[PDB]
Design a protein around this ligand. Structure first.
Ligand SMILES: *[C@@H]1O[C@H](CO)[C@@H](O)[C@H](O)[C@H]1NC(C)=O
Ligand SMILES: *[C@@H]1O[C@H](CO)[C@@H](O)[C@H](O)[C@H]1NC(C)=O
Lengths: 49, 49
């Protein structure tokens, strides 16, 4: 629950930009919460992570 | 040409480990928490030293 790609389109919204620097709410493909984003140049993700 | 077929098999069970992840996110060390006394100290301190 609250992670994955089998999503329910009962409540439909539009995709927004991943804005950095500001305190926002987020709904990142299931993951919900509040916080601040910051774009980084990461190299530790595989094709399945 | 001096070749050999080898197929080593061991059973599995559900148990707790202590895993070590490095900078790049690779598992480099592991310790079975119920194998010895040093493993007990390593899993109670959550440290590999
Ligand atoms: C604080 O406010 C300024 C402008 O009012 C904004 O640019 C900045 O992102 C805000 N900082 C946080 C952490 O929300
Ligand atoms: C294969 O192993 C034997 C061991 O007695 C050795 O004498 C022989 O030279 C080996 N053959 C090759 C091609 O390495």
């Amino acid at each position: 629950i609250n992670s994955g790609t089998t999503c329910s389109n009962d409540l439909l919204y539009s995709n927004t930009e991943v804005s950095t620097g500001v305190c926002v709410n987020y709904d990142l493909y299931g993951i919900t919460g509040q916080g601040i984003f910051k774009e980084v140049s990461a190299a530790y993700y595989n094709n399945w992570q | 040409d001096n070749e050999t077929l080898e197929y080593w098999v061991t059973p599995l069970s559900r148990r707790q480990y202590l895993l070590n992840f490095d900078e790049h996110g690779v598992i480099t060390n592991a310790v079975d928490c119920s194998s010895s006394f040093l493993s007990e100290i390593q899993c109670k301190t959550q440290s590999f030293a």
